[PDB]
């Protein structure tokens, strides 16, 4: 089944491409700035549907994280024109490129908060971090800075979907290993850090691992599984029995076809 | 092609005619065949569309009865060389079948091992065109005691061939087929057996099969004495001895009851009929073997065994599903082939 959540974000494919285009066109890139914009869209009962976006200019200092420049007024006037075009376009959130977070992320957030308590922050990188979905969404309010593993899926309107198409187990398994490796890197990292007296001293991180191990996996290993297994083969044995029968049934329908083809050919003179 | 065919056919007609019109015995027409056989010798690679087995074939059948015309081997051996292997394959393959027969009847099946090794070398033919190949092939394997393998080959032989000369050929295959069930020790139902072969002929095999199913030795000996002849006739004698073992082996198997103890005494009473008093020794062999398994105390005069209620709870059906799917699947691919 697909993953769903309390709040949910749907981000349109149109939106994503727009960021790709913004990064190359503004031509400011090659200074390695944050490419930031405001996201617009359609929201209802508890669904963010990101219907629209627009880029915002920004210039930040390249030797100070306290000194950055952004204009509010630009947001009102442009918003005003959008309201005039389509009134089904509310302020949902904003976007930042990532792939790392800033202190300053907190600073763009305070502003969007005012306009609506819920401001989604989407971390979008074209440059492929992940070979599944390379876009991840968080929703943040400060305590400190929170995050949320809110689903991201690509819904669409009728027009949007056709355009996409104009332009144009095994998958599971590659991803599965991937995930293992990401955690693996983190442990090696943790060991290093602890060795060299670096901030990690988080209780949570040890706590999650311990429980996880107790359970064990069952697509490998037998160690914890063996008692469960005894039941398991018996159920599988039955599914297979069913499968057998149906293969004969299929085979039979193929015989009917052949006999008919044979008859037809034979009487004709024979020609395929 | 158009001129070739009448000349050969005249030769061919010549041979039909001489049998009991220019003979009165099956050793006088032969003199006439031998001079005509020259023709085959003469054209080498100027042809490949031929049949050339017949002359040699008529000569040859007679040696199979128990007569002396063993000269013929020399002749077939030369022919396998004349065809290169890479040239004139289909005709070579037919010849190899007739040589293989001659050898099978009389002595050393070992020379067939080799023949088989030849048989799989680059050909432009197939060895399943005349089922007779399978029949010979089966006896070889039978001796060696692969009951299963012989079964496959024989059964494939029965497919796509009888509906004419079903008369003689089904009877020979059918007699061996029955024997193989006895040898394997797994014997099917009595209903089935009736309809194969000629009914009169079916009868000696049936008496034998029934005795083996009862699993009692004395009846097996009495019937066997009457039917010395069949084994002799066939040219496969070794079977007569081999079957003796099988009765006893079925008999222990037959007697499988249920309970954590069966008295040793009980087994011994049933067993008394099979063998005078060689009972425990047989039983021990059987348990050890792993066909059945048990613990015996002669001390407490009981046999203790394992219980089973756990069938269908372990891999034995898993093997079955896999084997069964496969049969259906080959034909499903096959229908598409057309």
UniProtKB/Swiss-Prot annotation, chain A:
Modified residues (N6-acetyllysine): 183, 193
Residues in MPN domain copies: 9-143
Keywords: Acetylation, Isopeptide bond, Proteasome, Ubl conjugation
PROSITE patterns reported for this sequence: MPN (PS50249)
GO annotation (BP), single: proteasome-mediated ubiquitin-dependent protein catabolic process
GO CC list: cytosol; extracellular exosome; extracellular region; ficolin-1-rich granule lumen; membrane; nucleoplasm; nucleus; proteasome complex
A Pfam cross-reference name: MitMem_reg
Domain of life: Eukaryota
Function in brief: Component of the 26S proteasome, a multiprotein complex involved in the ATP-dependent degradation of ubiquitinated proteins. This complex plays a key role in the maintenance of protein homeostasis by removing misfolded or damaged proteins, which could impair cellular functions, and by removing proteins whose functions are no longer required. Therefore, the proteasome participates in numerous cellular processes, including cell cycle progression, apoptosis, or DNA damage repair.
Quaternary assembly: Component of the 19S proteasome regulatory particle complex. The 26S proteasome consists of a 20S core particle (CP) and two 19S regulatory subunits (RP). The regulatory particle is made of a lid composed of 9 subunits including PSMD7, a base containing 6 ATPases and few additional components. Within the complex, PSMD7 interacts with subunit PSMD4 through their respective MPN domain. Interacts with TRIM5.
Family statement drawn from the similarity comment of this UniProt entry: Belongs to the peptidase M67A family.
Additional free-text comment from the UniProt record: Does not bind a metal ion.
Protein name: 26S proteasome non-ATPase regulatory subunit 7
Species of provenance: Homo sapiens (Human)
Lineage: Eukaryota, Metazoa, Chordata, Craniata, Vertebrata
From Swiss-Prot, chain B:
Sequence similarity: Belongs to the proteasome subunit S3 family.
Role this protein plays: Component of the 26S proteasome, a multiprotein complex involved in the ATP-dependent degradation of ubiquitinated proteins. This complex plays a key role in the maintenance of protein homeostasis by removing misfolded or damaged proteins, which could impair cellular functions, and by removing proteins whose functions are no longer required. Therefore, the proteasome participates in numerous cellular processes, including cell cycle progression, apoptosis, or DNA damage repair.
Phosphoserine found at: 263, 275
Superkingdom of source: Eukaryota
Organism: Homo sapiens (Human)
Shown residues within the full chain: 156 to 493 of 534
GO cellular component, one term: nucleoplasm
BP terms from Gene Ontology: proteasome-mediated ubiquitin-dependent protein catabolic process; regulation of protein catabolic process; ubiquitin-dependent protein catabolic process
Protein known as: 26S proteasome non-ATPase regulatory subunit 3
Gene Ontology molecular-function annotations: enzyme regulator activity
All residue ranges annotated as the PCI domain in the record: 131-310
This protein's UniProt keywords: Isopeptide bond, Phosphoprotein, Proteasome, Ubl conjugation
Oligomer status and interactors: Component of the 19S proteasome regulatory particle complex. The 26S proteasome consists of a 20S core particle (CP) and two 19S regulatory subunits (RP). The regulatory particle is made of a lid composed of 9 subunits including PSMD3, a base containing 6 ATPases and few additional components. Interacts with UBQLN1 (via ubiquitin-like domain). Interacts with ERCC6.
